[PDB]
Amino acid sequence: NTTLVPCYKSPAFVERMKNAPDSYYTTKPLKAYSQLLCGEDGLPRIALDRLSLAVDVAIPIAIFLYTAGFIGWSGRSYLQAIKKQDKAEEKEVFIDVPLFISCMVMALFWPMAVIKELLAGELVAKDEEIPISVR
Amino acid sequence: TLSGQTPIFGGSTGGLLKKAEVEEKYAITWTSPKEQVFEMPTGGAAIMRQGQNLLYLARKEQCIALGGQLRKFKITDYKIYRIYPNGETVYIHPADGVFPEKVNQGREKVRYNDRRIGQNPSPSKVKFSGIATYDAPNS
Amino acid sequence: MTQLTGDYAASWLPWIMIPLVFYILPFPVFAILFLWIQKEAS
Amino acid sequence: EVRVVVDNDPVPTSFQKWSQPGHFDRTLAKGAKTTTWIWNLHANAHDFDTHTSDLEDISRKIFAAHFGHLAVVFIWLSGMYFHGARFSNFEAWMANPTGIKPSAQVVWPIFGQEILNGDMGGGFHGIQITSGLFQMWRAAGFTNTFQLYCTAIGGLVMAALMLFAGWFHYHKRAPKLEWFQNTQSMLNHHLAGLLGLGSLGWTGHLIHVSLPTNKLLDTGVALKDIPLPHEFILNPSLMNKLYPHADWGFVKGVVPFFTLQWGHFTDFLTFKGGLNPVTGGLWLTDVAHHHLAIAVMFIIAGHMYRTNWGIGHSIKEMLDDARTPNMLPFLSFIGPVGHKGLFEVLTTSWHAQLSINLAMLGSLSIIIAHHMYAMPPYPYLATDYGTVVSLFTHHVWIGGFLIVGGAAHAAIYMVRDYDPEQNFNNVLDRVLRHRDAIISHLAWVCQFLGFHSFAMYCHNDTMRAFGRPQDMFSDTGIQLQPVFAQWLQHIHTMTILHDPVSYAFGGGVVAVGGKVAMMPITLGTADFLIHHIHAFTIHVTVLVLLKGVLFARSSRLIPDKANLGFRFPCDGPGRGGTCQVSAWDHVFLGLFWMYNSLSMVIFHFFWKMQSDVWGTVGADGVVTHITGGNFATSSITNNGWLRDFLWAQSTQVITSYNTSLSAYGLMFLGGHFIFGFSLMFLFSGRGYWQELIESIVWAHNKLKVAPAIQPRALSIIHGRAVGVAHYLLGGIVTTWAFFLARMTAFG
Amino acid sequence: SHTVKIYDTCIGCTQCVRACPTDVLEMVPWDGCRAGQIASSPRTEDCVGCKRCETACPTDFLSIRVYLGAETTRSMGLAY
Amino acid sequence: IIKPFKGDPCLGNLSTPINDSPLAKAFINNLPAYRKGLTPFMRGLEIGMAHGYFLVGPEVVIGPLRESAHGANLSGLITAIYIAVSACLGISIFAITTFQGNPKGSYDSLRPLRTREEWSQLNGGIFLGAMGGAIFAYLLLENFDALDAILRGAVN
Amino acid sequence: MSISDTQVYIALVVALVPGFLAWRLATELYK
Amino acid sequence: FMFLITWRGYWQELIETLAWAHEQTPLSFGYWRDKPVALSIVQARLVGLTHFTVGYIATYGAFLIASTASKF
Numbered sequence A: 001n002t003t004l005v006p007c008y009k010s011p012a013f014v015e016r017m018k019n020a021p022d023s024y025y026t027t028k029p030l031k032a033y034s035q036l037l038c039g040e041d042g043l044p045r046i047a048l049d050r051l052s053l054a055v056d057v058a059i060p061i062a063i064f065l066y067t068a069g070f071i072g073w074s075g076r077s078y079l080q081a082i083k084k085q086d087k088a089e090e091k092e093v094f095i096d097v098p099l100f101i102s103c104m105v106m107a108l109f110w111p112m113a114v115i116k117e118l119l120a121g122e123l124v125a126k127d128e129e130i131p132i133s134v135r
Numbered sequence B: 001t002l003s004g005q006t007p008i009f010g011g012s013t014g015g016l017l018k019k020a021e022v023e024e025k026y027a028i029t030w031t032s033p034k035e036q037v038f039e040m041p042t043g044g045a046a047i048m049r050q051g052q053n054l055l056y057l058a059r060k061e062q063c064i065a066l067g068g069q070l071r072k073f074k075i076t077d078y079k080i081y082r083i084y085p086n087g088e089t090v091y092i093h094p095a096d097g098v099f100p101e102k103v104n105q106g107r108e109k110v111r112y113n114d115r116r117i118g119q120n121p122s123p124s125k126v127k128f129s130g131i132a133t134y135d136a137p138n139s
Numbered sequence C: 001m002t003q004l005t006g007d008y009a010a011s012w013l014p015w016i017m018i019p020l021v022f023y024i025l026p027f028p029v030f031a032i033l034f035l036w037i038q039k040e041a042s
Numbered sequence D: 001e002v003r004v005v006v007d008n009d010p011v012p013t014s015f016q017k018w019s020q021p022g023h024f025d026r027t028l029a030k031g032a033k034t035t036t037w038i039w040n041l042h043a044n045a046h047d048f049d050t051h052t053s054d055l056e057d058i059s060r061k062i063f064a065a066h067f068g069h070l071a072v073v074f075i076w077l078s079g080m081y082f083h084g085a086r087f088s089n090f091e092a093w094m095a096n097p098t099g100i101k102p103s104a105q106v107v108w109p110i111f112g113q114e115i116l117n118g119d120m121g122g123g124f125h126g127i128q129i130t131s132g133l134f135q136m137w138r139a140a141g142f143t144n145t146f147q148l149y150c151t152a153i154g155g156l157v158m159a160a161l162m163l164f165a166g167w168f169h170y171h172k173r174a175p176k177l178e179w180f181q182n183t184q185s186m187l188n189h190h191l192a193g194l195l196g197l198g199s200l201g202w203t204g205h206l207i208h209v210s211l212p213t214n215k216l217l218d219t220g221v222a223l224k225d226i227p228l229p230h231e232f233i234l235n236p237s238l239m240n241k242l243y244p245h246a247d248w249g250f251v252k253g254v255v256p257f258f259t260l261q262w263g264h265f266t267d268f269l270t271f272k273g274g275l276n277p278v279t280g281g282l283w284l285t286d287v288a289h290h291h292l293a294i295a296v297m298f299i300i301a302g303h304m305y306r307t308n309w310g311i312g313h314s315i316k317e318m319l320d321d322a323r324t325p326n327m328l329p330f331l332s333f334i335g336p337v338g339h340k341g342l343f344e345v346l347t348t349s350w351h352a353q354l355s356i357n358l359a360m361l362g363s364l365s366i367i368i369a370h371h372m373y374a375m376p377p378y379p380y381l382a383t384d385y386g387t388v389v390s391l392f393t394h395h396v397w398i399g400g401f402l403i404v405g406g407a408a409h410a411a412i413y414m415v416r417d418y419d420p421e422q423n424f425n426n427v428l429d430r431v432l433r434h435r436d437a438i439i440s441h442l443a444w445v446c447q448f449l450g451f452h453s454f455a456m457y458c459h460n461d462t463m464r465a466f467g468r469p470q471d472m473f474s475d476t477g478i479q480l481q482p483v484f485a486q487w488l489q490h491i492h493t494m495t496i497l498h499d500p501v502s503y504a505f506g507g508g509v510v511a512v513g514g515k516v517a518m519m520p521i522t523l524g525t526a527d528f529l530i531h532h533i534h535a536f537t538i539h540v541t542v543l544v545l546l547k548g549v550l551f552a553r554s555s556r557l558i559p560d561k562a563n564l565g566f567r568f569p570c571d572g573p574g575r576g577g578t579c580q581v582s583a584w585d586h587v588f589l590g591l592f593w594m595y596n597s598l599s600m601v602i603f604h605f606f607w608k609m610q611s612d613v614w615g616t617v618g619a620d621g622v623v624t625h626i627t628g629g630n631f632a633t634s635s636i637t638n639n640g641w642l643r644d645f646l647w648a649q650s651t652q653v654i655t656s657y658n659t660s661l662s663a664y665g666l667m668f669l670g671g672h673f674i675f676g677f678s679l680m681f682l683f684s685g686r687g688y689w690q691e692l693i694e695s696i697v698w699a700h701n702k703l704k705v706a707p708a709i710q711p712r713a714l715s716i717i718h719g720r721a722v723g724v725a726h727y728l729l730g731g732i733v734t735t736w737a738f739f740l741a742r743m744t745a746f747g
Numbered sequence E: 001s002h003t004v005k006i007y008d009t010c011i012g013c014t015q016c017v018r019a020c021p022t023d024v025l026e027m028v029p030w031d032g033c034r035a036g037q038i039a040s041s042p043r044t045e046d047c048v049g050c051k052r053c054e055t056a057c058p059t060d061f062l063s064i065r066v067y068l069g070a071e072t073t074r075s076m077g078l079a080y
Numbered sequence F: 001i002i003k004p005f006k007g008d009p010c011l012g013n014l015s016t017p018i019n020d021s022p023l024a025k026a027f028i029n030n031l032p033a034y035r036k037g038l039t040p041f042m043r044g045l046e047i048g049m050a051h052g053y054f055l056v057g058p059e060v061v062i063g064p065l066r067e068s069a070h071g072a073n074l075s076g077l078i079t080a081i082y083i084a085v086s087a088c089l090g091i092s093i094f095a096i097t098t099f100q101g102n103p104k105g106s107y108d109s110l111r112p113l114r115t116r117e118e119w120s121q122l123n124g125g126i127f128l129g130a131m132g133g134a135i136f137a138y139l140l141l142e143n144f145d146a147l148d149a150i151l152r153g154a155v156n
Numbered sequence G: 001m002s003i004s005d006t007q008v009y010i011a012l013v014v015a016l017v018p019g020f021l022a023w024r025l026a027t028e029l030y031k
Numbered sequence H: 001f002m003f004l005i006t007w008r009g010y011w012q013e014l015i016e017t018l019a020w021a022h023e024q025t026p027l028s029f030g031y032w033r034d035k036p037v038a039l040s041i042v043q044a045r046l047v048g049l050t051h052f053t054v055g056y057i058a059t060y061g062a063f064l065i066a067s068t069a070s071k072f
């Protein structure tokens, strides 16, 4: 809808493909930028449309936010593993890698494991068991 | 009053100033069974004598930093005075003869609140009043 | 020009008011403002 | 007796203590309660004087840690010779040392960073190095990259040799305390055996490798015709067309040295005293003669002190005889004790020795920087303008960090190793007994010079803005000439042997080809005013650091300061406030003042060289300098330093995008980050930050992801140490990226 | 002339009295501890304000405070 | 040798060759600030005249009026009027404000002017001193071309 | 057409009325 | 930055030294009515924020004025 013409018929992007070097950085990644929306200066913008970029914007969400909550869930399930062993003061410096990998492959299916603790009420700690200040 | 021989000190620069002549001046007095050398609180090093020693200092923190040094020379008999310029020597440390670390009787609970520290009143309790919130005569 | 003039009315008045309030009067003023800062109560 | 004593196997060799970090301090070995244990493990790992108490077990840790350090220099020294071997254009540079730029350290083809591989001349794509390694290997006689490669191999087997000798002298044969305490015998083998046999070994390399090779390289033998350096000793007829006044035989050519007919050596041991007008460096006959007079003077002076054969001097008797029955009568004020009890200071404590060895190695590295620009020692060094400035700027910064370290350990000595027993009324007691007269007159001459060097830059800045250029301290207005420094430039050119040593003083313009190597550096009012900026900033750097050495024991504020420690934040908010009263926080404040002092030394250098020394010579004789006489007229206002130096000479680092100087434009802007980032730690305090972790710890205790290593804000000392480690990092890398983008855009 | 108040969470470990550089605090007898002691501050005119008694108190949210008030010539440590 | 200050090792000074010499003690204790047997007006009259005389110096040769000759000596005198009015203002302001119950301590050397009638007399000396000296060095500078001649015999 | 020479002197005596009344307020607020 | 990087007890040991050299010198007839101390902790945070602010405004209020009234 906007003035973000695709880079196929943008009259300022074809000069970036006209005089350019070759090696690996300005030939194959430049013809892959051709299906991207670009303004009046030939630079590929990132707009948010309804359906033409519905999943084109949702791959950087769903790919990142899975392995954002994969680092976070394997770090949460490791700190909870070493506190039931009653040795958490010394297991945080010397990382017990047979358990941290065991708590990593338990976090590979973390979206269907967080909601098993939300409906069971075990994700959050209740407010009368958390240290606070004089308030 | 006070008396004693000064230690062998070759003069310093961190010693007394015009405050010691005009406002107040302190004097520590100990006795030594040895001709040993100690570090001055005014910078340097001095040799204390074998009789009664006497050293004029400028403020009370210099005497007890020196008094904490003589207690490592196993000399625990020092008396600290406070000399007003009219000549009035009061005797301030140790006041009762006993050191303030170990307990003696007859001493008073002075500046003592009979509450926990966390239950001091709010500063809006004492608004436009003379007292502060840590004086607070309730509990 | 090579001189500070004034086309405005009473152009002699910055000639005396700029030396007055900036280097002639303030050392009297800093004297009076020092005699009540360091004034003793009895 | 000066005998050797060792200890047979004092320390076991096992990985049992590698599994227990913090074993050296007793409070660190008991566990990691908070995250302050993380930082205290690295702030105390080399404090060997607090791990143990005895000097016999400390000094074995010192001796074995020098070996592991020497094995780290040899890794880096084998990385400079290996990068000149495999990843350089040392072949193309040695053939043509004018058109081809010195380069090592090529960049990998990933992430588009091969734009840093600019054209170095001759089809080589790399980064123009400014370290002077290429000009130094030519002076050593390197010709092919095989000789560089088997120097890098020979240093890796010298790193494993020095690393084996640190394991051997801590775990197998560790010496005893009376082996470390004969410092008279140590000075005999370091003067004569290390500095005397090192400059006797090197003058044997110069006349046998460097003097034949650099003679044939000036005739342009183009690296086929030149012989390998063993062919000047195996074939002694080859070094007879060169230097014919000698004989050059295995036994027949040495005998002029023993029969004292030293006129046979006068063609390759000269006293010319000038720059080689084909290369720009000093004559290598003049350098090879110089090391021979240094090796004689050091091997002689290594027989001064008395070891076990009776004869010699003893420092114990020379120090204890400087009392005051025997002095000059105008310096007879230093005590009837004198400095008895001072040989016991520099033998029974390593911090007393480190404070002299750092201030001497710091002041040596600035003397070195001032001599390698005025008397350039290497062939084609002086015309590589990116190398002249990056070797002055390097050794000034290196040699100014070590000065602040010489004043840090002169304050760790007072807090820890100072003894009023052995120092009664000696030359060190009498300094602490008047330390309010040292600091009163130092804090006046810092104040006298701040008005008479900086406020004369604010007088010129106001007269230039007023339109009164006849009222300011110019060469055209009120002249302030360096009368006593223009006179020493007159002395050092009227005492010439026949060639004018150091063209910086006067006479001659060395203009070896294309650019100009050395020119007279004349001194006007702009050089009077800037040498008092240096005199002002050195004195405040002294005043900050000397106040931390004298007032490390006690003060009038805190008279028991030596019991609180060397590295403590404060003594509470009493007495009005006593923050930064320690001796550590005068090293911390003297690091900013070292920075401000040395960044004006390298800015005085970088602008006086461009305007009054460097440039290009045409076909008539006039020189067009890089900025063109700009220092004389515009370096007297600090709007001129802002406009004509910082704004006008950063047009090469600002407009350095899309080009081969692209990383210098990023390090310039990455430098400004770390400076402004430093001000978070310097300006704020940890009670805001500890009270901010508590609201963030809550959001982890809520989601049950709280740690047991309890998150604490950094210490007061640790928050000040990371605010000066970033100021002195992002303030240096923004000057490194500006000195090098400006000069590697020219050459 | 600061204000050193002392609260009843004391345990009588005498650590604030050994840490005071100016002899402001001293131990008086009491009934609410095993040592039978509590600190008192009779020489609060000698309070230099440095809060070194506060770093030595081992009770959680410490039983002694220094309230920095109207500072004078001996509560600021001026030898001149 | 450096002994303690007047025999007291507890005092914060040293009896050094600069402050306790025979020479530099007989020079400092004979300067008009410390000379024995002077009224405080004659102290200030001699202190002032030595100061008005030199303070017209640094403005008639490197001042803003140095290019001329008759106007140069005016801007050097006008400087030393303003330096010595505002300094003799500051010591009437000093004696009003420090003599109120603490006469430099009623209980001592290097400051022997502790009375407020010995300081109001001093302020009258430094005013008339530093402006007799400022005029004597003004009349010797506007008459310099006539004083070069009588010190060279050019007046026969 | 700027203001006259007298209108400057008229303004200087009118502004003595909030110059003296500023002194009555600054001392009734008891400095 | 002097009031923000350097803190109070660097300067109290330095004013303690310049007040020594004033009492022990001749011909200096002044004497402080009230004793010179290094100014307090929460004061130099304000004294060093006043200069930070004024130097933020004198620099940008002279760049915004002079880079617009010259190149319009």
Ligand code: CLA
Pocket: C013, C014, C015, C017, C018, C021, G011, G012, G013, G015
């Ligand atoms: C408060 C507003 C204000 C401000 C900022 C100024 C500013 C200035 N005036 Mg002024 N002036 C004012 C009001 C003001 N005027 C009014 C109302 C009158 C009519 C009486 C005048 C009449 C006047 C004359 C005749 C002259 C100036 C001049 C000047 C300039 C230099 C100052 C000086 O030497 O003269 C001294 C100032 C006065 C004699 C009068 C100022 C007092 C006014 C009435 C009130 C200001 C006090 C203020 C409220 C204090 C609060 C601030 C405090 C809390 C810090 C300066 C730019 C000089 C000039 O033209 O420069 C080229 C000049 O000679 N003014």
Ligand code: CLA
Pocket: D139, D140, D194, D195, D196, D197, D198, D199, D202, D287, D294, D364, D367, D368, D371, D372, D377, D378
């Ligand atoms: C006074 C001593 C002295 C001086 C002036 C020089 C000078 C020089 N050396 Mg060197 N050298 C020396 C001692 C010295 N050396 C010693 C003792 C050794 C053995 C450890 C060496 C081993 C050596 C090697 C391997 C090489 C050189 C090279 C060079 C040239 C390079 C530039 C440079 O070093 O910066 C200038 C240096 C200084 C200004 C001082 C250096 C520090 C010395 C040790 C100070 C000694 C203290 C001295 C007694 C006190 C005098 C005060 C003075 C420092 C101001 C240059 C002409 C290079 C070369 O051959 O060029 C062609 C080279 O590759 N030297």
Ligand code: CLA
Pocket: D443, D444, D446, D447, D448, D449, D450, D451, D454, D455, D458, D540, D543, D544, D589, D592, D593, H001, H002, H005, H006, H010, H014
């Ligand atoms: C540009 C900012 C700046 C300025 C102006 C100063 C100024 C000063 N510093 Mg400082 N410092 C700074 C930044 C600055 N610093 C920073 C960023 C740090 C961070 C680490 C420090 C840390 C530091 C330390 C640790 C020390 C100083 C000291 C000093 C004093 C040096 C004595 C002197 O030079 O006399 C000359 C005065 C000047 C150079 C200031 C400029 C004078 C102007 C141009 C003249 C003013 C004209 C006129 C009088 C104005 C009056 C007009 C009227 C209307 C009011 C001096 C006042 C040292 C000291 O105490 O000295 C004894 C001291 O030890 N500084």
Ligand SMILES: CC1=C(C/C=C(\C)CCC[C@H](C)CCC[C@H](C)CCCC(C)C)C(=O)c2ccccc2C1=O
Pocket: D680, D681, D682, D684, D685, D686, D689, D690, D712, D713, D714, D715, D716, D718, D719, D720
């Ligand atoms: C920001 C700031 C802090 C807070 C500083 C902190 C919290 C240090 C930040 C370092 C972080 C926490 C590094 C930790 C890295 C972790 C180990 C995670 C890495 C794990 C991966 C590598 C897997 C202070 O404590 C402080 C104290 C005094 C004056 C100023 C300041 C100050 O400015």
Ligand code: SF4
Pocket: E009, E010, E011, E012, E013, E014, E015, E016, E017, E037, E038, E039, E056, E057, E058, E059, E063, E064
């Ligand atoms: S304040 Fe501290 S030292 Fe005093 S009684 Fe309480 S716990 Fe013990």
Ligand code: SF4
Pocket: D574, E004, E019, E020, E021, E022, E023, E024, E025, E046, E047, E048, E049, E050, E051, E052, E053, E054, E066
């Ligand atoms: S403030 Fe200082 S002197 Fe006062 S009670 Fe606390 S530690 Fe003692």
Ligand SMILES: [Ca+2]
Pocket: D468, D470, D471, F063, F064, F065
């Ligand atoms: Ca002029």
